[PDB]
């Protein structure tokens, strides 16, 4: 029926539904079939009570185990254009085992499948497994590690959460891949300035066989059958135009990059800490500090690390220190240089991670503790927290300076994007993983000196000197940010200091 | 409309409902909406099985979570004159977390609120967070800890429980605040005897922006706009009168009597009992002893108690004695020297703190076993027991057993009062806290000599020589104390065995 | 509208219902209401799952708690002829505390109570509390620890369980108390033989305010208003008759008193098992051994017993041996010297005392395993505590492997006290070790071999020992006979016969 | 009515139903009644969601307990041809107790029983109990231990699982017991070659009341009333034939017996694992080591082993190595030397043995992780996995086959067999227990020299010199082994790489 099928049930589904509906809003009616081992009464009730509208969308809730070929016959599995396996609310091993079993069951359909499979997993190690047993039809979104992986992106550099919400979220922007016959033999330095209403930053290469290369080298001009990856409000924006001239300038280069403090605190025993400590060794070089709030004996945690294969003898860019305490009792958090942490991270821990109601509660509690204790300790740092619940992610109501909670809706949004164009998975898997490209903002001192009047494209070419494709600007105002504006590529007026959003390599 | 809204469902709801109805009885009726994550039909059934009369007040049951904005719209939260966030019965931290998120969701209303929020919190540590989140329009009531504090007071000064019940309860003589334009420029010590049908306690000074000072110095001169805080029968029952001619005189009898080391027993282990321990240390004379008969093993007792943040090292004039056993097994209780304890406090154990009637059954068994052992082993001890139930509502028992005991009804009453007039909570706080003023029962010889004939106003004027406000008396052979007596100008001959209940500084 | 009301729900509900139904058939029917915190439809299903006959009695199920007045009013508590508060499953002290709360709530009824309250209680000490709140209205049936005592009693009197089943149950026979103005002025020793169809046990003395003296003196002269307590078949089957001619034989010979150090095994941990230990210590000769095979760790057991308030030094006859293991593992049972035990008691464990069938499964496994091990490796008395009499019925055609007894007896007891509350006193005195108790005695105590005499003459011989002869079990009879029909007629008696007597301590 | 009745409901039920359906195809159809304490509508839904064809057999779903006589009479237990009491969802000791109470209730039926009772047991000790109350009418199938022993056997001779599957399953090969008046007075060693379309295994001796010896001595001379036990396709497919002239060869070579000390890995903790340990200790050569990777703490392991009656000191050929970790966590699995193990046994953990799919899911993850670590760490180890929803678990879409896995379906098959012909249980009881004789896969060089041209009957007669009954072969390049070959008198160029399937004495 060319419909979207979802298997299982979790806190994420809600936001996922919204995302998908938004998509189908641009292409007419939408049909999503959700099936799980639950009452058809129970599912439809929760569906009807959601806080957002399903523009031109219907949700068909059915009771059945994804492991039974007949229950999959009921949901037109062999006809769905996408099959989204959701992670089980609870223990991650149970969720991953059931996910592998559901993918096996999906392979077991004798006729075949019209679409692909989008699996939400909870560990990096098990990912490989699914790709072995589902092969072609399978795309895996490692949810847990991905959220912990962009937690450091939003924490190191404050204000990056809403950027991912607007890019991944189908409302404002999303990734599009379009074949433009005009620009085949065009220099990539000329291609990125060939689009006004969008910003091209990726390239599919026929000679690599549809492989998408992010941040290609400027001087590579492409084949006739090639597709460019741009970002815009909708799939149809104004591109390409005649090449506008830019003031080709020079970087006031600040070779030293001298102050890179990045004393960073973790206030959680996250289920995979080796993952976060390893992704974070791409931050800096000068004795990058890293503090771990354990709640667990330290001799135990060194074994926890060697379990993940992580070596203290190997980590090149940070040498970390360990402190033990508790995150709901106040005097333990008291004895910390909270005022000397460029970032504080309030995680949900191994213990009580399955409990959606209590880990998030501990997170909110620690946030309130830190703000109040510091407000009485003085005679401004950055804080970010992890909230598992979608209801509590919706509890964004406080618009103050510390309101950085990362919805796991991002994962949902990811599951939505891959559900629509699986190619984009291969781009998220690169923009998330630290190797290869990554989204940084304000990477180098003085792209901009002394209040210049340079246009956005002049800066794109100025910063391409450091393998950087430029994406967005902010203003001196807070709680606002705009990404790839359609109005004016070339301009004379704009803010003074370092409101700069980029893809780079580090 | 202006209706009372209650979010959640606990054992204290019925009592609360009762008080609310009493309050609305003066208005000819009222409206209460109750919303919880329960079935509507079952909620209405439970309302039907409650034995009191609603007195023209209607209770409406709606099934919803206070975290969804739509359910809040279903119960007209924006129109409600007051919101009462009850605490769930299961876990102190679980109810505290639910309350924190409920206050957050009530802030999440886009249209705003019309009334104020009264939040029942089950722990002092988590309370501060909700105070911070609520800010301008939130009042917090500390439940478990207030019960703990009041029990020791009633144990040392017997009969205070019924006094608190009558004063807090709307059944008679609740706190009223009214502006009297006639009374202005009069010193407060004359303003107190200016009301024949009411007893003035404190003053809300308009010059101080409206903070209610309790037990002010007599020199205070009334200002324009200032209002009176008084104890009276009903809203239209009290009115000022010309000052009655009254003997000022001087009856200080100043020959003081030293204190005496006392012996106290704690039955069962109570959650947050460390606060009770500290309060009892501050309350007793040097060289006093506290016995603790708890099922918690002696090894875990010191950890679990110091885990509560109690430095035994800061102990001043208490000695600790530990005993292990079940509070309902008679053979365990006979092992203790019950006759040697100056006071006994039967506490609802932390192990069964959740269940109301399941815990109060164990407490009642303990009481009956203690009294039967004191009767049979003998060839008079004051005993106060923690009750939560409608069990006390029966009150089959007679006075010889001190079956008068502290109840959860106090909590309900407090909630209702703060739902009617906000500031009252602050009042109660200083009254319940050791700081500021507090209620006391004092012997008659403190204020008068034996067989001395005088009137109530003269007694009040004599108490004022101690910065104390006379609120009432209990005669020698009277069961119940009398609060706000009617015959204030008329003489009675007072007995050395009589007692007086006064608001006094510390 | 007078009818029986039951508050709570336990496994004993079905059996109790059966007994009540038996009682009400003579009146053409009756009514029983059951109220607990359960679904009405599901309770009605549970009623449907009961295999016995209601005999014109209707059972009403209502969903409500016995603590709210509205639920009690839905079940017409003020009009009810009797209230039966079961001890709902869970923690024994918690169930007894809830029984105290239920009694307190029943006192709160504004309109008052027509009938009396029957309280199922587990702990013996708390009983007075329930009386304190209940006063006149309350009858407490504390049978768990006395049942434990009775198991030990059966280990020396192998058939006593069925005797208790027949007496407590309304089917075979029952205690009846009635006023016969005819017998006024008669010595009791004549009242005993004055009933052909019944055996008089006690007297309700009006001069004593209504107290029932059990096993009264023969010299007692009946006064006006006194009533007779008898064991009889039914209410209208017994009536006094002229005295039968009976030979006063007066020929009991005093024999050699048999005493022997015994070896006993206790399988599984029983609630308040320290009480059973204390009862057994008084029962055995010195240098005797009590073995205890429990899953409870050997280390934790001494604490668990001293919490029960049992000192080991002062009890002296028995010596204790402790062993740890599971009663359902055949290997663990092989670890015990099963062949050496004079008696073995499979006890329903405290962990599964609530659940009927889960407890009886372990008990059945343990019994069959012990029997098979005694068969594979080589007289042993074996008693088994069962909680579903349907288990003893599923066992059928007399397999003869066990002497068995159930907690279902408690239901019977409750039923008795629900009909005639006076009878409770009787029960008390018989179940406690103090005062009177029922016993099975050998024939040689009362007669010589092949002596030809009638039941009445043996009964008088027993009166020479301050005991009321109530029945006999012949040598080759499985079922013992209570209140025999042929009392006046001669018979030849064998030493292998046994007699059932109510005797003082 | 003579319908089949099943008391209880477990995960292995559907498979069992399938087997019954196959059998009832031979009779033109059948009827199966299922009674359990579950919803009727849900039970019929589960039946409707079963993917196989019932072949004219009708399934009836009723909600009731086998402990109430009224439900048993609602399902016509007295008229039933066979009763099958399944065990499910409880500690092995609790579910066996449910079965014991069920058998007692079935004895309690006053009107009597038309058929016999087949009782699935989870513990070996309890069997006699089920006998004692049941006596003649009960046949006991000791389920869990059967799979446990069979896994260890398959690890040392790979592919034995499919052999057991085919022989127990009614599809390709069944045991038949039939009387042939023609073969009277004939030596058993001649009765062996008398059937062209069938392989004679045992004899039903009338002199012993019908007890059947499965490997009679060659000298045994058949008596009147005796019946023959054979492996055949169907009841009407095999018949006796005149004796073929066959070369009475001699055994090729007697060898030095060399025993190589082996290395075994146990993933997950299995109920009664001490039994697997002791069997393997009896099976292996000295100086061998057994690794055990389960989440149960090593401290608790000593208790869990000693209550099962395992003394570590009494082991005489095996030394124990203990390792702790989660079987679905890759990093824990990397800690073990996976490449060095002569055999690996992925066991469904006791913690999830009740739950059907959770155990095989964890097992599948563990298997794929072990294989992937073996792949990614490199400059031919035997691997067996316990699976419980097998037909679906053996993926059939990507031409993908699991590594010699073992199934819970075997239990269903066994039950079905004993439900159809009760006598067969004796066979199973002797074949599945290590006592008496048992099935084995044996290398070819024991029986012949390389490139020797001879027929199946001649190899079988060679095997008879070692008290072994040759029942089949697996060729060198064969995915499946051949049981009851069709051309038995005919020659073939046998390679040493071939293997033979034989019923042999223990020693």
Author numbering:
A (entry chain A), B (entry chain C): 320 to 698, 726 to 852
C (entry chain B): 320 to 697, 726 to 852
D (entry chain D): 320 to 698, 726 to 853
From the paper:
Two DMI1 homologs, named POLLUX and CASTOR, were identified in L. japonicus and both of them are required to initiate symbiosis. To address these fundamental issues that define the primary function of these channels and their role in the symbiotic process, we performed functional characterization of the LjCASTOR channel and demonstrate that it functions as a Ca2+-regulated Ca2+ channel rather than as a K+ channel as previously proposed. We also determined the high-resolution crystal structure of the ligand-binding soluble domain of LjCASTOR and reveal that the entire soluble domain consists of two tandem RCK domains that assemble into a tetrameric gating ring where Ca2+ can bind and regulate the channel. Our high-resolution structure reveals multiple Ca2+-binding sites in the RCK gating ring and provides structural insights into Ca2+-regulated gating of CASTOR.
To reveal if Ca2+ binding induces a similar conformational change in CASTOR, we also crystallized the apo form of CASTOR gating ring with the presence of 1 mM ethylene glycol-bis(β-aminoethyl ether)-N,N,N′,N′-tetraacetic acid (EGTA). Compared to the Ca2+-bound form, CASTOR gating ring is biochemically less stable in the absence of Ca2+ as demonstrated by the broader and less symmetrical protein elution peak on a gel-filtration column. The obtained crystals diffracted to a much lower resolution and the final structure was determined to 3.3 Å. The crystal has a space group of P 21 and contains four subunits per asymmetric unit; the four subunits exhibit slight conformational heterogeneity among them and form an asymmetrical gating ring. In comparison to the Ca2+-bound state, the structural change between apo and Ca2+-bound subunits mainly involves rigid body movement of the N-lobe of RCK1, causing alterations in relative orientations between the subdomains. In the Ca2+-bound state, the N-lobe of RCK1 is tightened to the rest of the protein via two Ca2+-mediated interactions at cluster I and cluster II sites, respectively. Both interactions are missing in the apo state and consequently the RCK1 N-lobe has more freedom to undergo rigid body movement: at cluster I site, the RCK1 N-lobe slides apart from the RCK2 N-lobe; at the cluster II site, the RCK1 N-lobe swings away from the C-terminal subdomain, resulting in a slightly enlarged cleft between the two. In the context of gating ring, however, there is no significant change in the ring size of CASTOR with or without Ca2+. The two diagonal distances of the asymmetrical apo ring (between the Cα of Thr 323) are about 61 and 66 Å, respectively, whereas the equivalent distance is 62 Å in the symmetrical Ca2+-bound gating ring.
